[PDB]
A paper describes a structure:
5 is the terminal oxidase of cellular respiration that reduces O2 to water, coupled with a proton-pumping process. The third proton-conducting pathway, the H-pathway, extends for proton pumping from the N-side surface to the P-side surface.
Complete saturation of the azide-binding metal sites is not attained by exposure of CcO to 20 mm azide for 2 days, whereas elongation of the exposure time up to 4 days does not significantly change the X-ray crystal structures. Thus, in contrast to the binding kinetics for the second (low affinity) azide-binding site in solution (faster than the time scale of minutes), 3 days of exposure at 4 °C is necessary for saturation of the two terminal azide-binding sites. The discrepancy is likely to be due to restriction of flexibility in the O2 transfer pathway induced by the crystal packing.
Residue numbers in the entry:
A (entry chain H): 7 to 85
B (entry chain G): 1 to 84
C (entry chain B): 1 to 227
D (entry chain D): 4 to 147
E (entry chain K): 6 to 54
F (entry chain A): 1 to 514
G (entry chain I): 1 to 73
H (entry chain J): 1 to 58
Amino acid sequence: KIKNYQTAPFDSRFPNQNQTRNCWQNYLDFHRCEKAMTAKGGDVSVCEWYRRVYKSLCPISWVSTWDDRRAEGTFPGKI
Amino acid sequence: ASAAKGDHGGTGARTWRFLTFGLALPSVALCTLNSWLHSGHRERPAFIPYHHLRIRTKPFSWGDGNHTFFHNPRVNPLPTGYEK
Amino acid sequence: MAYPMQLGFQDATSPIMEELLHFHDHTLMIVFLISSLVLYIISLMLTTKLTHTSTMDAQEVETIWTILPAIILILIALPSLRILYMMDEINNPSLTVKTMGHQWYWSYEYTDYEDLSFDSYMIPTSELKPGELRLLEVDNRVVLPMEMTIRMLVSSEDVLHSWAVPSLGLKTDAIPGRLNQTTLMSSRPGLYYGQCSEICGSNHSFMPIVLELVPLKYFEKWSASML
Amino acid sequence: SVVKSEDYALPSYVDRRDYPLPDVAHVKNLSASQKALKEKEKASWSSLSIDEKVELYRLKFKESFAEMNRSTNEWKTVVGAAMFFIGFTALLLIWEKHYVYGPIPHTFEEEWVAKQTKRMLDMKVAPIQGFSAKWDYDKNEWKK
Amino acid sequence: APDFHDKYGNAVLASGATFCVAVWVYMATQIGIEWNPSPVGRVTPKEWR
Amino acid sequence: MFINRWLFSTNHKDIGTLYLLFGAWAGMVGTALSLLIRAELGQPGTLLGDDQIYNVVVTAHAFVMIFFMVMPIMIGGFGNWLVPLMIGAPDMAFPRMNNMSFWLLPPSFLLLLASSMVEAGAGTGWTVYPPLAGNLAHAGASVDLTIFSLHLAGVSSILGAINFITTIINMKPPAMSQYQTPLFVWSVMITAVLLLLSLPVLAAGITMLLTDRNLNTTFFDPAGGGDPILYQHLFWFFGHPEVYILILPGFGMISHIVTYYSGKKEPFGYMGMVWAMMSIGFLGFIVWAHHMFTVGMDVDTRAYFTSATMIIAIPTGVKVFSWLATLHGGNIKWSPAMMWALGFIFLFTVGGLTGIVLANSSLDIVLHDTYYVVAHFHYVLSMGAVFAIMGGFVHWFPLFSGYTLNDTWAKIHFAIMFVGVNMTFFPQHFLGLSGMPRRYSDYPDAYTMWNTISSMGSFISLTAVMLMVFIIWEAFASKREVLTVDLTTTNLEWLNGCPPPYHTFEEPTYVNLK
Amino acid sequence: STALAKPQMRGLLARRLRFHIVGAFMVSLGFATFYKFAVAEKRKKAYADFYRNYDSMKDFEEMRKAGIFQSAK
Amino acid sequence: FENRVAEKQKLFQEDNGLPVHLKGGATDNILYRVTMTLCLGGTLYSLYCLGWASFPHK
Amino acid sequence: ITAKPAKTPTSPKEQAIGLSVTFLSFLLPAGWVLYHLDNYKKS
Amino acid sequence: HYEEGPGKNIPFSVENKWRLLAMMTLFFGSGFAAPFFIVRHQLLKK
Amino acid sequence: HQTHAYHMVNPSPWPLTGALSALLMTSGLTMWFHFNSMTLLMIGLTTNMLTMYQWWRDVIRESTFQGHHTPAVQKGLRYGMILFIISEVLFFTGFFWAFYHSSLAPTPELGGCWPPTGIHPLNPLEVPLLNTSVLLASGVSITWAHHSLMEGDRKHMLQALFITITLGVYFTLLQASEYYEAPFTISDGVYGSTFFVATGFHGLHVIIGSTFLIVCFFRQLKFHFTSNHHFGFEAAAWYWHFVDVVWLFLYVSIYWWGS
Amino acid sequence: ASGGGVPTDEEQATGLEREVMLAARKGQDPYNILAPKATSGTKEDPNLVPSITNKRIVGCICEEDNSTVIWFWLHKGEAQRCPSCGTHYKLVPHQLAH
Amino acid sequence: HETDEEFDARWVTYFNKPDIDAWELRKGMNTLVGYDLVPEPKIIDAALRACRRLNDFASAVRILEVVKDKAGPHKEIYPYVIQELRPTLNELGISTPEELGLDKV
Ligand code: HEA
Ligand SMILES: CCCCC/C=C\C/C=C\C/C=C\C/C=C\CCCC(=O)O[C@H](COC(=O)CCCCCCCCCCCCCCCCC)COP(=O)(O)OCCN
Ligand SMILES: CCCCCC/C=C\CCCCCCCCCC(=O)O[C@H](COC(=O)CCCCCCCCCCCCCCC)COP(=O)(O)OC[C@@H](O)CO
Ligand SMILES: CCCCCCCCCCO[C@@H]1O[C@H](CO)[C@@H](O[C@H]2O[C@H](CO)[C@@H](O)[C@H](O)[C@H]2O)[C@H](O)[C@H]1O
Ligand SMILES: CCCCCCCCCCO[C@@H]1O[C@H](CO)[C@@H](O[C@H]2O[C@H](CO)[C@@H](O)[C@H](O)[C@H]2O)[C@H](O)[C@H]1O
Ligand SMILES: C[C@H](CCC(=O)O)[C@H]1CC[C@H]2[C@@H]3[C@H](O)C[C@@H]4C[C@H](O)CC[C@]4(C)[C@H]3C[C@H](O)[C@]12C
Ligand code: CUA
Ligand SMILES: [Cu+2]
Ligand SMILES: [Mg+2]
Ligand code: NA
Ligand SMILES: [Zn+2]
């Protein structure tokens, strides 16, 4: 739909200086999307946008810690 | 509100005694039955080593350093899970 | 950077820093004038042998004393809050860069496209090359494209720090578990320095920030070379 | 005469230009001739001599206005002593430099400063007013 | 009668001022303090690269 | 007799004297720590060690000056000596609990000196923010000994505040309304209300820090869902009122000193001075996040804290202008206490006006955590709280002791201190505007010139502090006993003589209603 | 001989205060004119003049040729 | 029980110059010495513990 | 304020002694520590 | 009762100026010296 | 001889022994947390208890036995007790602020939800509701005790005060049992931290208020109170209402709203 | 519902508390709980100031609502005047034994 | 409020009271010098005659010193006031502070 992605755009749901929930929400949406798509045998490529946004915004160590916790069974958000 | 009760005229011990035995202690007796009824051990949830729980940044100053002060073996897992 | 015997702010490198300088000028005159108006009444009160020691009526003069300061405060607050809301306006960044504070250095992550990240440490004094600045230089500078709106996101992986660059008017605290955002836009190429701005232990004085602002195409090639 | 600590609750004498008529006379006990001068004061004041008038004034009051209001040389002692102790301070600082501080960093060596100064001009440090603005990049010298 | 200030005031003022100026000038100029003044108009820039 | 009198006291004057001696001893400790700060910074490079030992010294400097010098002298020392005498009361309402507020201070100070002796000290800043103050980055006992030192100081002042409130409300003559009490008495009452409400919130926050550090709570640790910024709110909810607690009794003494040496029977605009102190005490509880403008708060919160913070300039200006109006038409007596009060008026005004600069959050982005803030607050603390303290100490020393100071020496002392504090702090405005951070043991070379001058200033203030000890020794050594004091009809604390007997107002004053 | 004329005797302090508060204000307007002109206007003009024909690429090339950058030689 | 407050009023108002904390008789002295001994001894012990804790241990 | 003449006058010479001892009591112990800093550190 | 009057309402003696000088020297001098000895202590440890 | 109505207190060692007991308890907690030792702390707890005991003993000697509590003295003590209660309200407010800050904006570590992932709160309709009825009831029975005392009725005053203390002890035993049964602990993130620290300080105040009521009960048995003069009982009743109101805020905030 | 058993202040108040209660019953104020009401304060009708010694501090609030109180010692003997408003006061010593 | 003339008239009447006592003399002068004015000749004249009825020569002299002091740096005021009082000074035999050498420092 919209390549030439430069960075994550302004998002009126998270308009203030604290952007922690923006990173977190995009991380969740991405993984929720990918679970939905690999369940119904559909295509994860539709989840791409959330993936680009959380990669741009989120610290590498947060993503890495959240990925370890998903693998361990201790990720506390709902996916 | 006004409660739904109804007394006054000037001030008394008699009235507060009537409220102690006629309303306050009955309510305690009622809640005591309500409680002593939903009591008796609840089935413990599976253990998951969530990192925001079972915090240990410094050992506790008692026991082996790893047990909370009012640790209950039946319902309080350790960072490594329920005791054996 | 600051230069010897400097009295005021570093020259502005960004439009918002420019705005802060004129607003500071506006405020400081007031400060000047009030400071001096006081010193002067004061000396007027103290330089006569004439006396008047009986009870003096307060109500008229207290109207002057409250209303004129109230008006001065409004004259400072109006442009103050114009600037606060202007800096807060939506601006559309072309790039996002993260910085994480650590004891005692900064790391930088530029992960809009590729996995680019590195650490940035003070050059020790005994390794400075001739002409380099003691306590300010770093081994890996934060290269960035000039004339473009950049979103900086700041956090920490250990204690509090704070990521500052005075010539761009920037200071955002680095708090673990929180991602704070600020925007940066340099009008000019060059090297712009800052220093950790929240006490963070043994080497707080020694974890500086150097931004290297260059044309977009140079920034792109530097990015590719840093993979 | 002689004021005592044990008199603090009694009206007392004060020379104060804003309280010209204090609550008691400077001198209450009178000698035989002072008693005779207070009787003489009940008759016409034109018949008192100048010394008798001055003696009446000095029974009533301790100092005149001109005396209690006089200027003094105290400021010389204050300003001079304050300069002395400020001067003594510089002894402490000389001592500290000699015995406490070691060498400052090598970045303050003359050749370092010349090189750093050129590198600051090459990066156009404060080029609008503060630093590089003061350098003439055409003539390669400090602006006049 | 002359008090301490009448008799010693001039001397305390003259000597305190003399001493103060002398010891500050000395401290400021003779013992190796690096004031780090501006290079502007003072330093000839030298090749660094 | 000695132990009954000085360890078992129930007497407001002797307990006042104990606080003054304790606060004077703390002031020498805080002074030495400030000279170690300025020695470290007085040339480029490292003198002592790295930022750890340096910020242990900076942290202890602030806690000692605030909690062991200013608060004990202004409220424990002058409040206990003067308040009961200014209302004709026979003592404080709770004379025995008053002695426990005093005796909790040496143990609180002992804990703070133990914090700096064990491990590597608490190098946290007097704000004690986590996670730097937490048990990972400050492992071991030092920060818990600091927390406990603050709890003991906190209980001492909360019980003191209960005692002053009760005494001021309950023990005036029956005809005297609160609008017939002197301004210093109002200033102590307001400061005691601020203490009563703010200290319990600090006690809650540092208890939470204590349990995060020892009981595995996670109030301020994101791993458990906590937030380091919550600690900053709880700390500054106390810490802003605390600076108005440090200065209010100073405002109250300045009002008396200016009135007295202007030869006036009363300060100009008494009900406006009362209104101004109540308004500053009230507004001082709704402005605390001006200490947090760079933490990432929302824009509208930053707009509200900028505006509420500025508004305090209105009642504060009423008081400065009312002091000027009290001097107006006075028969001005240039005593050394008057000079301290005039220096207070001018230096407090400078520091208030740099506060106004800082209240603008957009400019505070650049000034925050730099030496511009350090310059702002040392103009109100080291040239307001200290000048009001030295003003009240030279003014009332003959009441407390029965002996006079040598006024020429005291004027010399004022002159040296005034030059030293301005040379120390004035250049720190330039360092802050040009970007030098706070809490640094060393600085880029460009900041050399102003740090050198500021360090030279601090030594001149050291010479003043040494001479002050000598001046006090000279007074007790010569024993010139006070005879008469002017204006007792409007300064009741002098009317029982100098020093007043152990028991005063055993027979209360007579005041009719009419 | 001649009698001395009667001088003003009343409100001398109020009169001195009136006269000087007005002189105090006049300074403030006079100083304000200077401070606006010597500092604030001068600044606006230094920034407007600097940027008017400023060429950022040319400034970049001078810096690059001087060797100051890590990313650009 | 019987009301013996008048007895205690006479005891505590006896004109014997004793401070209130010692006016109940010899048991007040004992309890006072026990308290003061534990406070002063405990304070010496806390100083010893500071001296021990002020230095690193093997 | 007025006061009596000193009961125990402190002459210029006694003031110079009190002033000197007071200044040395602050200067000597701090001076000894600072003089020996290199010894404490480079230990 | 207790002694009243100048020099008697304080927990230290002013009966002799030189003994007073010594006590004041020890009192203010110990508060001023303490932080330098603490720094010495901290430097000597590690 | 005074002719005002205020109390000049005899010189007393208890302010010093209490200050020292605070140094012993805090240096003792330090030696417990860091040097594996309880010695200093038990000595400071002991001296603190001894100090409280003798100091308040002496205040009873000064009032009931020596007559120094004139109306002006009593009025001061009223203000003192109200001001102290105000400062304890501000102390609890800091913990309520911590609770609402963490629960209104739950961070990602918790699952970004309140109660956090993995927390199973108590049911507020079980023992917590029972505890609420217990403390509300004990506010009714203390008011009965207060009116009987004013009406000169010794036996009903004692009967109602005993009831009120029995309910205080019931709530303390109920709470101790719920702490043991709770499947979460103080180490369970900010949920366990806020829960146990806020309810735990409240439990300590219930134990303090109950001790104070037991003091009043023994003084009443010894006839110390008159039908018009009984400030220790009034102060303990105000403190007891304070502990009840703090419980009501905790119940609504942490047990109910925060479940 | 009936018993007594609780002592009254009349039965059991003691020391100063009792003195104040017994004096208040007589309309008397030996411990200065109440503000005295002013007389017209002229030299024929001065404010009468009781005291147990030979002098007592007076505070004079010269006009209603003044915030400034004027303080001075009033001594046994001839009436003295407030130094701000001139209103007259005269000490009336007794001993709480007269 | 009141005119200048009415202010002056009330003060003239204050000092002119025949049986004015010493306390009232002192209270009147010490209150009057608190105001922002130097008292007119006619007020001073009535205070000086009150001195005379109270047989107090020294306080008449001190009243003349305080007029001079209240004029501050307006040195034309005191000589004008003494000029205007000369008939009263001569009638009552009041020497000025200058004639008594009491202006010498
Ligand atoms: C006595 C102590 C004291 C006092 C009275 C004040 C008074 C004020 N302070 Fe200050 N302050 C501190 C002690 C104090 N301060 C300390 C210790 C810190 C830093 C804490 C830390 O980080 O450790 C600090 C920090 C501090 C900051 C944070 C800066 C930062 O960290 O980035 C701010 C910002 O708002 C601020 C503002 C003010 C203001 C507006 C006042 C005002 O209340 C002043 C009002 C007074 C006047 C304005 C002068 C008189 C008025 C007139 C003559 C009328 C005319 C005036 C006008 C029209 C403006 N202060
Ligand atoms: C029935 C309730 C009464 C509490 C009884 C228990 C003893 C503690 C005393 C009460 C003080 C209360 C608050 C202190 C903080 C923690 C205690 C919280 C209440 C409590 O008792 O929490 C327990 C944890 O206790 C722990 O860690 C215990 C740690 C015990 C040591 C406390 C040390 C902290 C002291 C700090 C106080 C500073 C006070 C400052 C005053 C301010 C001055 C103005 C809960 O047990 P758990 O096994 O984790 O979970 C239950 C699982 N089945
Ligand atoms: C357990 C671990 C450590 C914690 C220790 C705390 C332990 C428990 C302490 C329980 C408190 C007991 C208080 C008893 C006071 C008895 C003295 C008393 O009640 O004294 C009364 C005066 O009140 C007065 O001082 C009022 C006295 C005010 C008392 C205030 C009590 C609350 C103190 C709490 C300490 C809080 C700790 C907070 C923790 C954050 C005496 O006057 P009346 O009663 O009018 O009698 C006179 C009549 O007889 C005459 O006719
Ligand atoms: C009369 C005046 C009052 C003054 C009293 C002074 C008492 C001094 C004696 C202290 O010596 C002991 O040494 C023990 C070590 O030898 C430690 O025990 C403690 O430390 C142990 C480990 O050392 C633990 O296992 C124990 O549980 C614990 O309570 C602790 O330092 C203390 O008991
Ligand atoms: C921050 C506030 C303090 C700043 C200013 C202090 C001014 C110093 C006062 C003098 O202090 C003394 O100076 C001596 C040197 O002048 C030192 O002696 C040292 O040096 C001598 C000369 O080398 C040797 O004889 C000695 O043994 C050796 O101790 C001595 O110990 C130290 O007490
Ligand atoms: C013996 C005594 C008589 C009181 C007296 O008048 O001295 C009575 C009166 C009220 C009594 C108390 C109250 O009735 C309440 C309690 C009831 C329990 O069943 C016994 C203990 C209990 C605490 C009683 C003990 C004792 O019998 C008391 C104290
Ligand atoms: Cu990182 Cu300071
Ligand atoms: Cu603040
Ligand atoms: Mg900061
Ligand atoms: Na340094
Ligand atoms: Zn009056």
